[PDB]
Ligand binder design. Structure first.
Ligand SMILES: *[C@@H]1O[C@H](CO)[C@@H](O)[C@H](O)[C@H]1NC(C)=O
Ligand SMILES: *[C@@H]1O[C@H](CO)[C@@H](O)[C@H](O)[C@H]1NC(C)=O
Ligand SMILES: *[C@@H]1O[C@H](CO)[C@@H](O)[C@H](O)[C@H]1NC(C)=O
Ligand SMILES: *[C@@H]1O[C@H](CO)[C@@H](O)[C@H](O)[C@H]1NC(C)=O
Ligand SMILES: *[C@@H]1O[C@H](CO)[C@@H](O)[C@H](O)[C@H]1NC(C)=O
Ligand SMILES: *[C@@H]1O[C@H](CO)[C@@H](O)[C@H](O)[C@H]1NC(C)=O
Ligand SMILES: *[C@@H]1O[C@H](CO)[C@@H](O)[C@H](O)[C@H]1NC(C)=O
Ligand SMILES: *[C@@H]1O[C@H](CO)[C@@H](O)[C@H](O)[C@H]1NC(C)=O
Lengths: 48, 494, 49, 97
């Protein structure tokens, strides 16, 4: 059960949660802050 | 000469009243127990750096220090803030003053104002053009050095000078030592008493017990082990890798073409195996619009693509708005459709001085479909028709899927360093970790590997086709083993 | 990702020492070691109780 | 525009009213609004301080912009209301707590 809980938690990092990408660095390397922040907030809400 | 800053150089950070509370704040404070440069005025008024900001302090018995100069050159070539206190009149000016080769006082202006035994402490910082002054005067009985102790400074003045300050100098009265300490972005815990006067402080980055007081929001710490921080190793240098190709991408052959195609039969040119400098297209003033839906236009220089396609055709001016993801209309739906997940930029300019005559060679009628009483209609473009003038539009479609990148912009590569923690960039893909040799057999078509979290596991070096493993630099929780502060201030770190 | 595992305070060896002590107590002193001092008793007599 | 909570030098076109103490009022101090009882206080604001704050970042006290005295703000009395009742199969009489 504990292994499953951790594996689930890690797999969630691959989710977009409405963002253009699950990868945080790919958002930052592509968008200027005024737009990057929106995409990041979507990931923060999902990951939090 | 240098001295110990101790616990001096904390100020009331805001005009908010607080009392009996252990509040915590981040501002440009003097770091606790750091060194400050000690200057003398016996039998010493050099120009010092201002950096991100300055704590200043002085000790007096006869009011020798009477002023300050702030600016970049301090020589009448730029505006320089001047503060002078002569007898009972404080004078503040921001003129392009002509200062002496060695300024002292004997015993295009935008602003003017006119109003050891003594320690006079000040804080100077220059935030978005505002010169903020905090200070505190207190009686002392000490000649040798700064007194040890705590008492915070109120804000007194805030001058909207808009001056770029990089250097400063003091002004002495000649017939009083002073100290200069650099402010840094250090978080503090501040003990507001019943009267609301800050009576004690704890710099967060001083030592592991101070981290523990910052983490527990308490000036007293109980006997135990406390997870104050996470230790993470930092990178040393960046590594930038791109295919070592010098061919330039033929954008001129798209944008400066003799003739554009009709929108019913739009052209699609493939751009590959080249260096794409997008600064030319972005900086050029010839474009009426340059709107990006995919990525920001200034990031295009670092970022690179598997392929880039240029969709080239002529439309009427008022229809420019329809070439975008999420749009509908007689053009967006009938003759030229973009994906609603389209990645890229739509660039357009009028051709009223080139295609217009009338010019009847332009005819109009799924995403990227070319559809080669009729549905077919055309325009007669004339130089006398703005919204009815012809526009040349080029849509740049970018494929960013993680695969070998054929289009990479004008950025020089660096050498690659193995077995060291580094900030890497492989074909626009960035991250931080240790690049090592690997035994991961990537297939010839594979460029990147991935982990369970979708993070990069390994990469193929774009210049030399070898596989490098990416393992994040060693990290872990810190913890501070401490007896109670009633027994000791000594601590041990895990 | 920031996911780590902390060790237990009592290692497997230490647990083994505790079960050994409990077992040795049970065998040589019955229940007396639970209440107070471990008072040796012939095992057969312990079983009689 | 700088809206940081500090003494206001430029205020919008609007007439002031008299201030009433020890009563529940709807107040507006330099554009800062809320509801509460304004009372005399012993909170020694420093000359540069205009507003005080609580843990929740709500306003604790204010300095009156016309006369520089400090007023405590205590939110107007409130509390849960409970109804004590025998079942309605017995009586429709209730008591209120
Ligand atoms: C302060 O100066 C002394 C030399 O007087 C030096 O040994 C010490 O490392 C310096 N500390 C810092 C924090 O710069
Ligand atoms: C202080 O300097 C000003 C010029 O900046 C001068 O006019 C004034 O007389 C001086 N001192 C006093 C005490 O007035
Ligand atoms: C004042 O600023 C202007 C620039 O607008 C400059 O041309 C002029 O020389 C300056 N005046 C002096 C005395 O340097
Ligand atoms: C506050 O000020 C009073 C004097 O008004 C003083 O007696 C007291 O020690 C000070 N410290 C407190 C209570 O915070
Ligand atoms: C088109 O030609 C102009 C010169 O008239 C040049 O400045 C511009 O950069 C060219 N456009 C492209 C995409 O090369
Ligand atoms: C990088 O340069 C080397 C020569 O040092 C060459 O052999 C190799 O093919 C180049 N790589 C790419 C991707 O063009
Ligand atoms: C408000 O009016 C009084 C006179 O009744 C005056 O003394 C006071 O300074 C005024 N306050 C402000 C902030 O101007
Ligand atoms: C509750 O009221 C109903 C009438 O609607 C009655 O028939 C029933 O007996 C009552 N029960 C009790 C416990 O009073």
């Amino acid at each position: 059960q504990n292994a499953q809980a951790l594996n689930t938690l890690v797999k969630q990092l691959s989710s977009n949660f409405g963002a253009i990408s699950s990868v945080l660095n790919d958002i930052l390397s592509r968008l200027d802050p005024p737009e990057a922040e929106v995409q990041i907030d979507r990931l923060i809400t999902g990951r939090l | 000469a240098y001295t110990n800053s101790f616990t001096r150089g904390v100020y009331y950070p805001d005009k908010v009243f607080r009392s009996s509370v252990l509040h915590s704040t981040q501002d440009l404070f003097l770091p606790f127990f750091s060194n400050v440069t000690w200057f003398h005025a016996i039998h010493d008024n050099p120009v010092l750096p201002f950096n991100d900001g300055v704590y200043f302090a002085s000790t007096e018995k006869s009011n020798i220090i009477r002023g300050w100069i702030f600016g970049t050159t301090l020589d009448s070539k730029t505006q320089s803030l001047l503060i002078v206190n002569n007898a009972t009149n404080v004078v503040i000016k921001v003129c392009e003053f002509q200062f002496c080769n060695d300024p002292f006082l004997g015993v295009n202006c935008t602003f003017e104002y006119v109003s050891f035994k003594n320690l006079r402490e000040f804080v100077f910082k220059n935030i978005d053009g505002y010169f903020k002054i905090y200070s505190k005067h207190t009686p002392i009985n000490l000649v040798r050095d700064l007194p040890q102790g705590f008492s915070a400074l109120e804000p007194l003045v805030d001058l909207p000078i808009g001056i770029n300050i990089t250097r400063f100098q003091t002004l002495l009265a000649l017939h009083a030592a002073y100290y200069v300490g650099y402010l840094q972005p250090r978080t503090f815990l501040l003990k507001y008493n019943e009267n609301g006067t800050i009576t004690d402080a704890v710099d967060c980055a001083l030592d592991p017990l101070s981290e523990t007081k910052c983490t527990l929001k308490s000036f007293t710490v109980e006997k135990g082990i406390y997870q104050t921080s996470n230790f993470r190793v930092q990178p040393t240098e960046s590594i930038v890798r791109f295919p070592n190709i010098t061919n330039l991408c033929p954008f001129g052959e798209v944008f400066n073409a003799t003739r554009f195609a009709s929108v019913y039969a739009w052209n699609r040119k493939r751009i590959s195996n080249c260096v794409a400098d997008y600064s030319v297209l972005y900086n050029s003033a010839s474009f009426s619009t340059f709107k990006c839906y995919g990525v920001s236009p200034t990031k295009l220089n670092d970022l690179c693509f598997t392929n880039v396609y240029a969709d080239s055709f002529v439309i009427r001016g008022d229809e420019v708005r329809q070439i975008a993801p999420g749009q509908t209309g007689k053009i967006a739906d009938y003759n030229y459709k973009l994906p609603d997940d389209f990645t890229g930029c739509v660039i357009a300019w009028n051709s009223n001085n080139l295609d217009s005559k009338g010019n009847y060679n332009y005819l109009y009628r799924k995403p990227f479909e070319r559809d080669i009483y009729f549905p077919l209609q055309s325009y007669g473009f004339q130089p006398t028709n703005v919204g009815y003038q012809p526009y040349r539009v080029v849509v740049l479609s970018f494929e960013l899927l993680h695969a070998p990148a054929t289009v990479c912009g004008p950025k020089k590569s660096t050498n690659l360093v193995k077995n060291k923690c580094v900030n890497f960039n492989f074909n626009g893909l960035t991250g931080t970790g240790v690049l090592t040799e690997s035994n991961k057999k990537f297939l010839p078509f594979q460029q990147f590997g991935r982990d369970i979290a979708d993070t990069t596991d390994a990469v193929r070096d774009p210049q030399t086709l070898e596989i490098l493993d990416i393992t994040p630099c060693s990290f872990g929780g810190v913890s501070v083993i401490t007896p109670g502060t009633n027994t000791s201030n000594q601590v041990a770190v895990l | 990702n920031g996911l780590t595992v902390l060790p237990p305070l009592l290692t497997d060896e230490m647990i083994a020492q505790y079960t050994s002590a409990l077992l040795a107590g049970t065998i040589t002193s019955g229940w007396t070691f639970g209440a107070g001092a471990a008072l040796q008793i012939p095992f057969a007599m312990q079983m009689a109780y």
